[PDB]
Amino acid sequence: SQQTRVLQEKLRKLKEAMLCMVCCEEEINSTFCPCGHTVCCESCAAQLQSCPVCRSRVEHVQHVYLPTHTSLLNLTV
Amino acid sequence: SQQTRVLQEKLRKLKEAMLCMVCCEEEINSTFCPCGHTVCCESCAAQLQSCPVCRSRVEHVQHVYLPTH
Ligand SMILES: CCCC(=O)Nc1nnn(CC)n1
Ligand SMILES: [Zn+2]
Ligand SMILES: [Zn+2]
Ligand SMILES: [Zn+2]
Ligand SMILES: [Zn+2]
Structure with a gap:
């Protein structure tokens, strides 16, 4: 129904919010310290000298x- | 439809996984350092000497x- 499409959209937006804001391909799993912004995967976080959200060093x-973390291991057999 | 029910279940489980493991009422927003376990709200995290997941100091x-906040 139309509600199936609405729920599909909410689920997609929630999952996209959990992906790295720089590469868009890997799950967020890194915090920039001391600002606390937790918006990147470990590969993009290692390459940034300043936070991409607030510009703090x-x-x-x-x-x-x-x-909420998942991996290829979570696949359904 | 049944598909709507399946999606509603996935959304509910994803939202429950975002809640504090101690109080179950507030969103997770704190990390225990240096272990990195990010499982509590600020109020519950403030009171713990050891990580409730791995027992690290x-x-x-x-x-x-x-x-997602
Ligand atoms: C309150 C907790 C919300 C949360 O865990 N968010 C989140 N954001 N990116 N991820 C990677 C799986 N997970
Ligand atoms: Zn990335
Ligand atoms: Zn920042
Ligand atoms: Zn709590
Ligand atoms: Zn821990």
Whole structure:
């Protein structure tokens, strides 16, 4: 029905919000410190000297383990 | 349809995974450092000496700003 399409759209937007804002291909799993913006995968976070959201200098990157993380292992057998 | 029910289930599970593992009422927005487990809201995280997932000592709590917030 039309509600199936509406729910498909909400699910797609929620999943897109969980992907790296720079490469758009990998899940977010890194925090820029000290600002706290958590918007990149580990590969894009390592290459940025300043935060892409607030422009604060990145002192270091903290890896984050989130309950929403998925990997190829989560595939349905 | 049945497909609508399946999508509603996936959305509900994704939203429940974003909630604090201790109070179950507030969104996760804090990381235990240095282990990196990001499983609590600020209020529950502030009171813990050790990570509730891996038992590593918490040296400090980093507030996180996620696009899903
Ligand atoms: C309140 C917690 C929301 C959350 O976990 N968001 C999120 N954003 N990107 N990811 C990567 C899977 N996960
Ligand atoms: Zn990336
Ligand atoms: Zn920032
Ligand atoms: Zn809590
Ligand atoms: Zn931990």
